[PDB]
Amino acid sequence: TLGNTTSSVILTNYMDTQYYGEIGIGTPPQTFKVVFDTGSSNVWVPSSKCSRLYTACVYHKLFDASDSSSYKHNGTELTLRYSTGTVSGFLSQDIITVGGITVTQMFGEVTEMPALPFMLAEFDGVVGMGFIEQAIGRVTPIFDNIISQGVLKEDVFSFYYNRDSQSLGGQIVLGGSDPQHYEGNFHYINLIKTGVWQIQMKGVSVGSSTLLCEDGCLALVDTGASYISGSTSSIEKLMEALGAKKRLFDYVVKCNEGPTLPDISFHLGGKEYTLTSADYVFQESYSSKKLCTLAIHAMDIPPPTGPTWALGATFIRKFYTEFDRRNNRIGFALAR
């Protein structure tokens, strides 16, 4: 069922690495800062039942079911193994408020939340925007429950991620897209298979030559990822070409050599998506005496999904993204 409604969630841009919005859980609503992540399909927030021995839980907002009159017990164990770090807890049900839309949703109450990386997290939890096929415990994803209400104008959602600042950090439109944040026309690429927000990539070029992904590869379009990532192998070739040196968790260049770095292109569908050094270098200074990080890192995503590249916030900043559930495709337009 299709309605005549669109709803928007305003996002906060933290250091160009974390983009988060607000949701309410329970009656009265308990508010959480959440990441709207297309790379995952579960909703989870830290729990009141999380041991204060986890420092992450001392530093984030915790859901207390004893304060909610709309809470429905479940308790089924849940383990979400993200390749950045794992979280575990149990399933609960309550009413979630996201941009005006009120939905009864099953989510995880996280009781084990490691300091790495959650002590670095500005957000409390995650709202998975992926498909039921990738949902742990086969829990219905929040967008599937919102679609079911037959209130949205279109069975689509859009992401706008701004460059850091009094300005808008970003925006998610549920049921459509905001033309004030894109220009030109959307160019769609169909998903390889339903269940994942992954598309086919025809090549990655450094300068003017297809130095990588020559025989074709995969591209996961991931709103919950900070960077553009590829396999350890691909990133090694890429960096060697850039003149960038490998540190423990990132790659750097001397700050003075940042503006001089070549364009990086991504052949997706019938279009070339180009990022300049201004789009992928954290130009903190122009000093020959300082190191500057890149918004590209290695990440070996396991099968079935991987090995794959991941187009995170680095990519979405340049290109406004529309996720079309009705036609199993992703649209891109130049962000305004």
Ligand SMILES: COCCCOc1cc(C(=O)N(C[C@@H]2CNC[C@H]2NS(=O)(=O)Cc2ccccc2)C(C)C)ccc1OC
């Ligand atoms: C841009 O703003 C977003 C916030 C950026 O900050 C953080 C992000 C994360 C992070 O990595 N998360 C999960 C990943 C995003 N997508 C799915 C998942 N990928 S994964 O599991 O690592 C590979 C994979 C993909 C698909 C299938 C299988 C395996 C979050 C959302 C829990 C952790 C700490 C962060 O802050 C210190």
Ligand SMILES: *[C@@H]1O[C@H](CO)[C@@H](O)[C@H](O)[C@H]1NC(C)=O
């Ligand atoms: C938890 O929710 C699922 C939803 O299908 C249900 O099958 C399961 O029995 C529930 N468990 C409890 C204890 O309510």
